[PDB]
Symmetry: D2
Subunit: 105 residues, 4 copies
Amino acid sequence: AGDTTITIVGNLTADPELRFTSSGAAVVNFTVASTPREWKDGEALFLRCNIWREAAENVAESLTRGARVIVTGRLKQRSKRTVVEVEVDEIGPSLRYATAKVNKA
Amino acid sequence: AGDTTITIVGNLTADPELRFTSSGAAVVNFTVASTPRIYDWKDGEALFLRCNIWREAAENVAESLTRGARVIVTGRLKQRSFETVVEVEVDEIGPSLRYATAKVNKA
Amino acid sequence: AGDTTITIVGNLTADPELRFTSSGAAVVNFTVASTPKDGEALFLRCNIWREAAENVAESLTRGARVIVTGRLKQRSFETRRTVVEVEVDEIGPSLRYATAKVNKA
Amino acid sequence: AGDTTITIVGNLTADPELRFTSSGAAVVNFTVASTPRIYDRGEWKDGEALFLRCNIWREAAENVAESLTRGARVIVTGRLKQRSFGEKRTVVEVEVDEIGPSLRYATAKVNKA
């Protein structure tokens, strides 16, 4: 029934925006700034991603603005206007230019 | 220096419209209607992704595909300026033989 | 859990191997030759079943350029090992260098 | 011209193994244990574990060695290569492009360079 999956590597434009909903389900919305083609150049891409629950909490606690992340999910369309968003499936900080102490839970 | 590659499986919303550009390069723009099936089964809302395929690959698509067609599309996400949108820079495309057959003609 | 999905583009090394089971279920096994002209060819084995399998067998032939999606799987030939295969989910002929007449079912 | 990029999510089977080469250029080899969760009747079912060998080079390799440990849940992107390991057997590996720790079950203190 058709589907989509995407992987992107980019930087958070700002610190993780935490909130909750009527359930008590943790929601974070953040944008990844990715610029294609380090040599040459592209035209910056801004993708909005949404991550939910446990994962959302951990994201908020761990990542900050400018952070270089690796994101996976599907594409989703927002609502007379449409916008493409990412239903984050997994996300983590790229260890290409950084280190991290990891804490299991 | 991030980057972003995507793969989608959908149906063309309409026959491929072939066009061109200042250089000569054939250009085809089309939309893929993809409807993800969720956990609960449930068929969540339809997605409409615009895809651009250029040069020869574009020509072949225009010749081969028609509306309704179930396709398999790979590429990268790109933004065009508003005042914006997300589009696919198709890298490869082809008709999913999940519900059909095809007579393939190399060049 | 874990994401083991993959998409690949290559050519079929040979005409697809149709075949059947006690059930009467169709199984095709074929190999995709992909070269990452920086290279060194990669040979992935792919298995596709039922209806889709039948369609492939009828449509595709050796040398064919295809677009394949599925998950990596690991199979047994464990002597003195394990091999990686693709559980094809969707497959089509890449229109990059060819045309095709579609005919839905 | 072929496309062999892949993304996987799994857990390191063991602590990252750092080593170098003729150059002094760093190299890490590790394995990711991924187990897909297959659906039939329905009801979840796991399914046979996959073990993919990944190689990551240079500064990224150093960072990995310093940050990650065995059991760690990672997100790896890269390309599949074939090498030559019945006498000369062949084995599919990942040329890691980008890697990081999945924040799905954990937090991390990130520190740039």
